[PDB]
């Protein structure tokens, strides 16, 4: 996690956050995504979803995983929840309520921990 990964998205245009890493065969991995809607604001963060899996590393066989948890934040606003997959978070129609800071954390059985911070804004509207 070097610094903020800035994402300029177009209005109602999808955005996909990707956290690329090479995992170790057999190690069990757990990922969490947290959303701070600080951009539209006008250790407590909203865990979007927590997932876990075990790396099979066949490079082709789509890896199964477990949806450990998912918050109901976006449903309280009657908006669709993000699509969370190993290493990626997807939003189909970017809107004001989706702007802000996304924090991705991955912890592995091998004793490894990795972070990644994203700042999703709008181009032409900042």
């Amino acid at each position, epitope marked *: 996690g070097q610094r903020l990964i800035e994402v300029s998205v177009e209005e109602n245009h999808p955005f996909t956050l990707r956290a690329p*890493i*090479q*995992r*170790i*065969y*057999g*190690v*069990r991995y757990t990922e969490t995504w947290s959303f701070l809607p600080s951009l539209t604001c006008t250790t407590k963060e909203d865990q979007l979803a927590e997932i876990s899996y*075990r*790396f099979q*590393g066949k*490079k082709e066989a789509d890896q199964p995983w477990i949806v450990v948890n998912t918050s109901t934040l976006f449903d309280e606003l009657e908006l669709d929840p993000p699509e969370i997959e190993p290493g990626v978070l997807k939003v189909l129609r970017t809107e004001k309520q989706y702007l802000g800071v996304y924090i991705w954390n991955m912890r592995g*059985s*091998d*004793g*490894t921990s990795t972070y990644a911070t994203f700042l999703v804004t709008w181009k032409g509207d900042e």
Partner: antibody, heavy 121, light 108 residues
Framework: EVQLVQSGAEMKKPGASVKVSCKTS????????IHWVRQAPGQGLEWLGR????????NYAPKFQGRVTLTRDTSIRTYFMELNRLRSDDTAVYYC??????????????WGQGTLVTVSS | DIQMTQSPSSLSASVGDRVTITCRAS??????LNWYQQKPGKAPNVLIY???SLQSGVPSRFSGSGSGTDFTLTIRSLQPEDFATYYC?????????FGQGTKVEIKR
């Protein structure tokens, strides 16, 4: 066929530095950790450290921290161990081995052949 | 560090005999204990991981059990090929510590 091939035996004088090599084949290089173990003449096994092929990051035992350095060359699929400030106690057979993981369990499936390091004057 | 004690240090036993080596840990290592077999002039070879899981190809006479502090390796029918030194290794916390070894000599 996972095969690990190490460098040849070496004689070093006290205070020198020994660099042992370990070339791996038959598996995805960047999907398995490699660690280094030492077997002294007539004694058991001792852990030096482990290295991740991807991050180039290593974890060392307390005794060898600052005296051992683990490096990698992913292009040639080769791991390196370096022992500095060599002493007579450091004479041993050094082994490089692959680590297989299942959940939080770890073990060494395929071992190298061994490299004898003799610290003599 | 987790100090791992192995017992006996050396056992003599005959072919077709049940043999049990023991590994004790200074703390609880959960299922993170592996058993290795070093044969003369060769690198150690894993037989059992996860305290009971048998490694591919390894004979079925080798069995592992235990939990936490105390663990045991059992060879049901000793065979002449089982002459070796046996080591236990903790996979729980780094640094990974090994046992002292148990030499199995075959009475004949």
């Amino acid at each position: 066929e996972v095969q690990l091939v190490q460098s040849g035996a070496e004689m070093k004088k006290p205070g020198a530095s020994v660099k042992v090599s370990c070339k791996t084949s038959g598996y995805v290089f960047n999907e398995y950790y490699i660690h280094w173990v030492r077997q002294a003449p007539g004694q058991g096994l001792e852990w030096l450290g482990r290295i991740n092929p991807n991050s180039g990051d290593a974890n060392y035992a307390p005794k060898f921290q600052g005296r051992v350095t683990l490096t990698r060359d992913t292009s040639i699929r080769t791991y390196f161990m370096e022992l500095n400030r060599l002493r007579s106690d450091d004479t041993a057979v050094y082994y490089c081995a692959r680590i297989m993981y299942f959940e939080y369990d770890s073990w060494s499936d395929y071992w190298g052949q061994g490299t004898l390091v003799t610290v003599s004057s | 560090d987790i100090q791992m004690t192995q017992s006996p240090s050396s056992l003599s036993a005959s072919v077709g005999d049940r043999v049990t080596i023991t590994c004790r840990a200074s703390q609880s290592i959960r299922s993170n204990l592996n058993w290795y077999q070093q044969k003369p002039g060769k690198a150690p070879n894993v037989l059992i991981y996860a305290t009971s899981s048998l490694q591919s190809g390894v004979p079925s006479r080798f069995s592992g059990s235990g939990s936490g502090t105390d663990f045991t390796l059992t060879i049901r029918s000793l065979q002449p090929e089982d002459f070796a030194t046996y080591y236990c290794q903790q996979s729980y916390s780094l640094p990974w510590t090994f046992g002292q070894g148990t030499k199995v000599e075959i009475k004949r």
